[PDB]
A paper describes a structure:
The E. coli 50S large ribosomal subunit is composed of 33 proteins (L-proteins), one 23S and one 5S rRNA. The 23S rRNA consists of six architectural domains that, stabilized by the L-proteins, define the shape of the 50S subunit with its three protuberances. Here, we present a biochemical and cryo-EM based analysis of the earliest period of 50S assembly, utilizing an in vitro reconstitution system with purified rRNA and L-protein components. Taken together, early 50S assembly occurs in a domain-wise fashion, while late 50S assembly proceeds incrementally.
In addition, we noticed that the 5S RNP (ribonucleoprotein particle), consisting of 5S rRNA, uL5, uL18, and bL25, can dock on a pre-50S particle as soon as the central region of domain II has formed. This can occur both in early (d12-CP, d126-CP) and late assembly (C-CP) and goes along with formation of domain II helices H38 (A-site finger) and H42 (GAC), as well as domain V helices H80-H88, representing additional examples for rRNA induced rRNA stabilization or folding. However, the CP remains mobile and upon rotational movement of the 5S rRNA towards the subunit interface, H84 and H38 stabilize each other. The presence of domain II apparently facilitates docking of the CP-forming 5S RNP and as a consequence, route 1-2-6 involves the possibility of CP formation either on d12, or d126 resulting in d12-CP, or d126-CP, respectively.
Numbering used by the authors:
A (entry chain F): 1 to 70, 76 to 177
B (entry chain O): 2 to 117
C (entry chain W): 6, 15 to 81
D (entry chain V): 1 to 94
Write the structure that this text describes.
RNA sequence: UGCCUGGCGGCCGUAGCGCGGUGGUCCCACCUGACCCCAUGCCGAACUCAGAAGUGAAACGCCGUAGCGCCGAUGGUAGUGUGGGGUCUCCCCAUGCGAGAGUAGGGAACUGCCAGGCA
RNA sequence: CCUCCUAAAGAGUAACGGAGGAGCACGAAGGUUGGCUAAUCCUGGUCGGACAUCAGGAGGUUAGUGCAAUGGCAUAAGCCA
RNA sequence: GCAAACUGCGAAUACCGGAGAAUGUUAUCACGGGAGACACACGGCGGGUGCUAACGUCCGUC
């Protein structure tokens, strides 16, 4: 909720005047943020998966959950663990990342507008996690990055563009 | 959809209870109110019904939905049903979780003398 | 290189605890005042009349027993 | 508009149908509208005679029953796979 | 005695899907924050706490839309029991039972009890 | 020892007629109560190529239901606690 | 386009169960005694096997 009040104060007015919605919640709003490094290299050994889980726990305020597969992978093989938030941690983590993580990107050519699901969600993988200062260089084992997929109530790609612009959408 | 899953869950309870043909006491939880009814085995008729919407319960309640409101509703329905002569009737939480308002209402009813 | 089908029929009078139909799968489901076995073998819970009907969201075939 | 006259069916079943077919005749029905549909007995020879013209199936036909002419449209015709015989003609009142 | 909503049954496609508008009077739905009752195989997602802070966005509510799905006559046809016949492989005769598909049409489900709001 | 047809629509109705599997196990892989509900294909995303990864979409069991086969399981007999 | 091991549809004969008419030496069932009986065949009805070539062979029924 660190940025929730600021969001409601600033994004809502501009989005309402540029769209002229009726209800307060008609503005697209993020519901969950997914952090899941698709390392896909723990097949040989699970130590890498343990290291990834530890990194997720350190970076995030919670502990990751280990999932299983739906490449030479069997059924029910645990390969990666994902992290998601729902609550104040949403805005806390988003504000932190947009303050320190997103601005500090090396060779930052910009986001990918086309990288949508076609229905109001954006998915992309940003490598060289060194952008996040929370990543301690002591415990880094390989060049990795977060496969962030923003989950938003946007009903179309136009709403996704508008809500990304609300966060100033640095550039393409 | 939460409604679909809730109805799916309640259907099993209802269909397993229907084998006995006994008057059911169905309680429904609403975000703003609480409903409680006693229905005969046929299901097309109800013996008694009371909800927080009625002034009889909301007069002393600042709001219709909370632990205190659930307890008051339970006491009222228990008194009315005891006046009716339930004689060890069966309860049903509309396929819900016995956690809050349902739990408080059931505890209040059992305090009044409910035999279930 | 043992016996399926309908053994007891609607409108018949049977004594308590009488097997009416055994089914390989759930082709039929026991109705009111009717029990079910491990092998989905329906047996009469009382004495009276037997009815075969079709009901349910999928229109499944059901077997019921009513007071004579 | 064709001056077509037929006879009302008196029996229900395959018996009269086969009797008509053997004697170079066949049955038919007239339905459509709130008025109750009725079965009719069409003579095969006359049907062949007045169906050769292409206008038979074009406009609304006239059927005469007990000296009563009514407008009916031929819904469909069912024929034998190889025998040029009309198994059954279905009409609609118009 | 009427219009509207909620709960519970018969009803299980003439009850479903597609389009428009209509609703915050009551009621209903979303929801704020949650250290407090409670909690996650991580998360107030659900569960539970103070309510209308905000709204009718989805949802449901009515009607029209027969677009779609569905049912569906009426006859006839196929098939066939019984007895017989022929050129007895197969077909037909007398009688009875009577397909599927298709067709006109129906098709915006209906019905029962309680509770609440407006007349 | 067991399942599918062969086989003329109650049960049965010859084959050396064609398919076959099983000689297993669980102190859980049973039960109690609670919670949840797949396959199939597609969109975005370094390796990852389209399918090692998550989010969303058509849909709600054609996944799964420890053993070969066949019927059944949405109330889930399917998964977890 | 196909499917004895395809059914999204779906017949009459055959079954017992309930009500009902006349029928027929009770034509129906149990018990007890006493039998033969344990190699049938022709044709028709719908099939399998067999090379539907078979006046070959086997099935349920008259």
């Amino acid at each position: 909720a660190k940025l929730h009040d600021y969001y409601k104060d600033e994004v809502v007015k501009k989005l309402m005047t540029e769209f002229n919605y009726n209800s307060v919640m008609q503005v697209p709003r993020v519901e969950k943020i997914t952090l899941n490094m698709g390392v896909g290299e723990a097949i040989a050994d699970k130590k890498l998966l343990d290291n990834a889980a530890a990194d997720l726990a350190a970076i995030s305020g919670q502990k990751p959950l280990i999932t299983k597969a739906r490449f030479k992978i069997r059924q029910g093989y645990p390969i990666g663990c994902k992290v998601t938030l729902r609550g104040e941690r949403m805005w806390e983590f988003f504000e932190r990342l947009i303050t320190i993580a997103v601005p500090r990107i090396r060779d930052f050519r910009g986001l990918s507008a086309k990288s949508f699901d076609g229905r109001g969600n954006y998915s992309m993988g940003v490598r060289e996690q060194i952008i996040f200062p929370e990543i301690d260089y002591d415990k880094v084992d390989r060049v990795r990055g977060l496969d962030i997929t923003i989950t938003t109530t946007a009903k179309s790609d136009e709403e996704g563009r508008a809500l990304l612009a609300a966060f100033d959408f640095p550039f393409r | 959809d939460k409604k679909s899953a809730r109805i799916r869950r309640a259907t099993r309870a209802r269909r397993k209870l229907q084998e006995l043909g006994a008057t059911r006491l169905v309680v429904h939880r609403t975000p703003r109110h609480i409903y409680a009814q006693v229905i005969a085995p046929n299901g097309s008729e109800v013996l008694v019904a009371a909800s927080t919407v009625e002034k009889a319960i909301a007069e002393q309640l600042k709001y219709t939905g909370n632990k205190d409101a659930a307890a008051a509703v339970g006491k009222a329905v228990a008194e009315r049903a005891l006046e009716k002569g339930i004689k060890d009737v069966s309860f049903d939480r509309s396929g819900f979780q016995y956690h809050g308002r349902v739990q408080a209402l059931a505890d209040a009813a059992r305090e009044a003398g409910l035999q279930f | 290189t043992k016996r399926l089908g309908v053994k007891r029929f609607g409108g018949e009078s049977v004594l308590a605890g009488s097997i009416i139909v055994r089914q390989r799968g759930t082709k039929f489901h026991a109705g009111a005042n009717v029990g079910c076995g491990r092998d989905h073998t329906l047996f009469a819970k009382a004495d009276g009349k037997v009815k075969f009907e079709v009901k349910g969201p999928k229109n499944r075939k059901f077997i019921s027993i009513e007071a004579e | 508009m064709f001056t077509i006259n037929a006879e009302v069916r008196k029996e229900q079943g395959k018996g009269a149908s086969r009797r008509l077919r053997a004697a170079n005749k066949f049955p038919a029905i007239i339905y459509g509208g709130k008025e109750a549909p009725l079965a009719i007995e069409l003579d095969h020879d006359k049907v062949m005679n007045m169906q050769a013209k292409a206008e038979f199936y074009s406009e609304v036909l006239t059927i005469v029953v007990d000296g009563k002419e009514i407008k009916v449209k031929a819904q469909d015709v069912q024929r034998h796979p190889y025998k040029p015989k009309l198994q059954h003609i279905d009409f609609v009142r118009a």
